[PDB]
Amino acid sequence: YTMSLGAENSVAYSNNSIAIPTNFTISVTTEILPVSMTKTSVDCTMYICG
Amino acid sequence: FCGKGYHLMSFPQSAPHGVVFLHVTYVPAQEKNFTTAPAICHDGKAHFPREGVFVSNGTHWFVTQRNFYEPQIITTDNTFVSGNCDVVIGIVNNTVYDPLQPELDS
Amino acid sequence: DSTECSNLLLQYGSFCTQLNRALTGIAVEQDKNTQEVFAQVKQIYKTPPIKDFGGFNFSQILPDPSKPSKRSPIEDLLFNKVTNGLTVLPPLLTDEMIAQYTSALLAGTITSGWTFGAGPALQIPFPMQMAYRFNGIGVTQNVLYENQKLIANQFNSAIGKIQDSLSSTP
Ligand SMILES: *[C@@H]1O[C@H](CO)[C@@H](O[C@@H]2O[C@H](CO)[C@@H](O)[C@H](O)[C@H]2NC(C)=O)[C@H](O)[C@H]1NC(C)=O
Ligand SMILES: *[C@@H]1O[C@H](CO)[C@@H](O[C@@H]2O[C@H](CO)[C@@H](O)[C@H](O)[C@H]2NC(C)=O)[C@H](O)[C@H]1NC(C)=O
Ligand SMILES: *[C@@H]1O[C@H](CO)[C@@H](O[C@@H]2O[C@H](CO)[C@@H](O)[C@H](O)[C@H]2NC(C)=O)[C@H](O)[C@H]1NC(C)=O
Ligand SMILES: *[C@@H]1O[C@H](CO)[C@@H](O[C@@H]2O[C@H](CO)[C@@H](O)[C@H](O)[C@H]2NC(C)=O)[C@H](O)[C@H]1NC(C)=O
Ligand SMILES: *[C@@H]1O[C@H](CO)[C@@H](O[C@@H]2O[C@H](CO)[C@@H](O)[C@H](O)[C@H]2NC(C)=O)[C@H](O)[C@H]1NC(C)=O
Numbered sequence: 001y002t003m004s005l006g007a008e009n010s011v012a013y014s015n016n017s018i019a020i021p022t023n024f025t026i027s028v029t030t031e032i033l034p035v036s037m038t039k040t041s042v043d044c045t046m047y048i049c050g
Numbered sequence: 051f052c053g054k055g056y057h058l059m060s061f062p063q064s065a066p067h068g069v070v071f072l073h074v075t076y077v078p079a080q081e082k083n084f085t086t087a088p089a090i091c092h093d094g095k096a097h098f099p100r101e102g103v104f105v106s107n108g109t110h111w112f113v114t115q116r117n118f119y120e121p122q123i124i125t126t127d128n129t130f131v132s133g134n135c136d137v138v139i140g141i142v143n144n145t146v147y148d149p150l151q152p153e154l155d156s
Numbered sequence: 157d158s159t160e161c162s163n164l165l166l167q168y169g170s171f172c173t174q175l176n177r178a179l180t181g182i183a184v185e186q187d188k189n190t191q192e193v194f195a196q197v198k199q200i201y202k203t204p205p206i207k208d209f210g211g212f213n214f215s216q217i218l219p220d221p222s223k224p225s226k227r228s229p230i231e232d233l234l235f236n237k238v239t240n241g242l243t244v245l246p247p248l249l250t251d252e253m254i255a256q257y258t259s260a261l262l263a264g265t266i267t268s269g270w271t272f273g274a275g276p277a278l279q280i281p282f283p284m285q286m287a288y289r290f291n292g293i294g295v296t297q298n299v300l301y302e303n304q305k306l307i308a309n310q311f312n313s314a315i316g317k318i319q320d321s322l323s324s325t326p
């Protein structure tokens with residue numbers, strides 16, 4: 001299929017109307033970030049020649 | 051930068067070769083329509099909100115903080131005066147209460 | 157197509173697999189970059205049919221209905237001004253979908269300010285939103301309201317100068 005970007009949401013804009021929140025949600029989200037790699041050392045003489 | 055929504059705090063957690071941030075954020079919800087105006091015209095003077103916004107539920111005007119609905123009476127303590135009513139486009143007529151008025155009235 | 161060359165090439169091992177894997181990683185990385193930059197909203201916002209923004213003109217940045225590509229005049233000018241075993245993979249997001257994402261971002265930031273980026277899109281009049289931005293930089297709301305026509309004229313003039321400068325600089 002041809003992918004859909006998102007659901008259409010026409011915001012009801014007018015020159016004298018505002019939307020004010022009456023409630024709230026405390027949302028906890030995860031962010032995973034790599035920090036380090038495995039420290040690998042290669043003996044060049046031993047690798048090439050044994 | 052620190053999660054989706056208005057960032058409140060974050061907690062670090064160790065991970066194998068990595069870090070996991072638990073971002074605690076504030077998300078607005080259950081929004082409601084209100085009729086808004088840039089300024090309030092009273093006694094030939096224009097009143098603007100000091101930190102909030104003027105909202106109307108249909109018949110009465112209040113001032114509330116922008117991120118949460120908490121309607122309060124429009125007074126001189128939460129508004130400031132700058133100029134007359136002839137310049138601001140969309141200014142509406144409403145009374146502005148004075149807290150000092152009952153003190154000398156009594 | 158030489159069989160003998162491929163037979164001799166097999167003596168060198170998995171070099172070809174390494175090169176193909178690196179190129180595949182680059183190719184998926186480009187799509188990941190495009191997703192990270194442009195696909196930051198999951199709602200496709202649209203502008204109201206009446207363009208009453210308190211004197212502010214956004215015709216040069218909103219999509220043109222007359223154009224089949226549904227691009228803005230600025231975006232159309234930008235697209236006009238940019239000109240043996242090898243294959244070119246097409247990008248996952250086409251130009252019209254990227255333009256649609258930018259249109260959604262423009263509609264969100266015009267009709268809702270910064271509210272759509274932090275949660276549900278909350279409608280606000282554009283002069284009031286501009287006043288909020290003025291308060292963000294430490295200038296009082298009254299200055300914005302009193303000089304609204306001047307600010308709108310300056311903004312329209314600056315947007316036109318941007319289009320002229322892009323059209324006039326190689
Ligand atoms: C604020 O008012 C607007 C306009 O009356 C509402 O927008 C309409 O909502 C209905 C209900 O789903 C939709 O069928 C219409 O298509 C909407 N109009 C537009 C132009 O989008 C809006 O829902 C109201 N907001 C709240 C929180 O009540
Ligand atoms: C704001 O939303 C919260 C949801 O987090 C509402 O809390 C719920 O209220 C109902 C009604 O009694 C309870 O049955 C739920 O158990 C409550 N949920 C939680 C997590 O406590 C809250 O009432 C809403 N407030 C307003 C004014 O709308
Ligand atoms: C807008 O809010 C005001 C403040 O609550 C409403 O005024 C109150 O209405 C109730 C119900 O009729 C009365 O019992 C109160 O005495 C009113 N308070 C004052 C100070 O007059 C007003 O009715 C609301 N308007 C709408 C359309 O909901
Ligand atoms: C808000 O109040 C002002 C001042 O009372 C109103 O302005 C008056 O409008 C009438 C009718 O056009 C004129 O005859 C007066 O000379 C005006 N007075 C001033 C001082 O300008 C204004 O019309 C009111 N607006 C609303 C919506 O009620
Ligand atoms: C917003 O700006 C656009 C472009 O600057 C205006 O469109 C121009 O309108 C005049 C008069 O109709 C034409 O002579 C120009 O050729 C138009 N320019 C283009 C690029 O088409 C538009 O009128 C302005 N105002 C509104 C309300 O959209």
Ligand SMILES: *[C@@H]1O[C@H](CO)[C@@H](O)[C@H](O)[C@H]1NC(C)=O
Pocket residue numbers: 015016139140208
């Ligand atoms: C909003 O637009 C209407 C016309 O559509 C106009 O009559 C009204 O005065 C405008 N209000 C503001 C605050 O700009």
